[PDB]
Amino acid sequence: LPVLAPVTKDPATSLYTIPFHDGASLVLDVAGPLVWSTCDGGQPPAEIPCSSPTCLLANAYPAPGCPAPSCKPCTAYPYNPVSGACAAGSLSHTRFVANTTDGSKPVSKVNVGVLAACAPSKLLASLPRGSTGVAGLANSGLALPAQVASAQKVANRFLLCLPTGGPGVAIFGGGPVPWPQFTQSMPYTPLVTKGGSPAHYISARSIVVGDTRVPVPEGALATGGVMLSTRLPYVLLRPDVYRPLMDAFTKALAAQARAVEAVAPFGVCYDTKTLGNNLGGYAVPNVQLGLDGGSDWTMTGKNSMVDVKQGTACVAFVEMKGVAPAVILGGAQMEDFVLDFDMEKKRLGFSRLPHFTGCGGL
Fold first, then answer.
1. Pair 112, 20: CB distance under 8 Å
2. Cα separation of 7 and 28, whole Å?
3. Are the beta carbons of 234 and 246 closer than 8 angstroms?
4. Nearest-angstrom CA–CA distance, 320 and 209
5. Which residues, at least 6 apart from 336, have a Cβ–Cβ distance to it below 8 Å?
6. DSSP 19-30
7. Domain 1-174 homologous superfamily, CATH
8. Backbone gaps in the chain, preceding residues (C–N over 2.5 A)
9. Which positions ≥6 away from 41 have C-beta within 8 Å?
């Protein structure tokens, strides 16, 4: 059966973790191609030649800043998605200890055999305390969903219900989408595979603030132009989309709030004493992404505003700087949606939960 693990949002880092084994957790990285962890001293490396199909899967999506040398055992290159650091590690057999589920509730304890790259302790910098590595949930052969699929003979497909607080849900292997009271009419949009990337991309055709379409330059919103990411809590926007979106949002907010000095990395922040509250969180303009398939991904205050410190909340849209997707949706835009990442039907289901519930404790 599919494998269920509870999801915790780390208060200090805002990253999301699942229990892995023995009190240790892994960070969920939906753009990450590998499962990697520190390993006990003397942990045996798996007997995998570098020429092996399995090794090829391990190095199919190279880590930025690391070699991938010439192919005699297999070396993979675990990548910390927060700090950007990488290092060599040997693949090794390990266990993902969780429960099976026939829907949303645990049935039996299960120990799933998976291959993980054994990383050095220094790669844990910037990860949550108690985390020992990363659970890559990208569309790659040695990502966690693909490995559960092979071990349990279930689907290369996973469900996320990321929490704002309390234990959310991750289910690896499909089955009918749970909570039909909320998900019976779940919209779907295609997952777009991009060459050279294992990440999950979808396509937005329009952006709307309140009821007014945000004008963007010609071709700005293109097939596969929206990436999903659990590395940051906020949205990253390419400059052609950033400016018109932020202008529309701040103008609409000013027509309904007192701006304050920006807190890095954010561009626009407000004094929370001057923000109202409605069912969706802070009373700020609704933002809708019109996706392929005709349904909208909606952002309310809980999605578009981040509490950074007492007295200040910042708009969760941050301009990309430096070196490409128009939009990278982050954690707080995924929170309290049931998301069905289906790499077999090549689609993403996205059910926004009603205001009176949420993923935590679901």
1. no
2. 9
3. no
4. 20
5. 161, 162, 163, 164, 302, 352, 353, 357, 358, 359
6. EEETTEEEEEET
7. Acid Proteases (2.40.70.10)
8. 71, 256, 323
9. none
Half-sphere exposure of 260 (CA within 13 A, CB side): 17
**Parallel, antiparallel or unpaired: strands 16-21 and 3-9:** antiparallel
Within the chain, which residue ranges are assigned CATH 2.40.70.10?
1-174, 175-362
* Resolution, Å (one decimal): 1.7
Experimental method: X-ray
Identify the sign of the CA torsion 149, 202, 327, 58: positive
Query: What does the block give as tokens for 21?
Result: 């084994």
My answer on whether omega of the bond before 265 falls inside 30° of 0, hence cis, is: yes
Determine the Cα–Cα distance for residues 152 and 63; give it in Å rounded to an integer.
28
Non-local (6+) Cβ contacts of 235 within 8 A are 316, 317, 318, 327, 328, 329, 330, 333
What's the CATH superfamily of 175-362?
A: Acid Proteases (2.40.70.10)
| Residue of 328, 309, 304, 329 lying closest to 253 (CA atoms) | 304
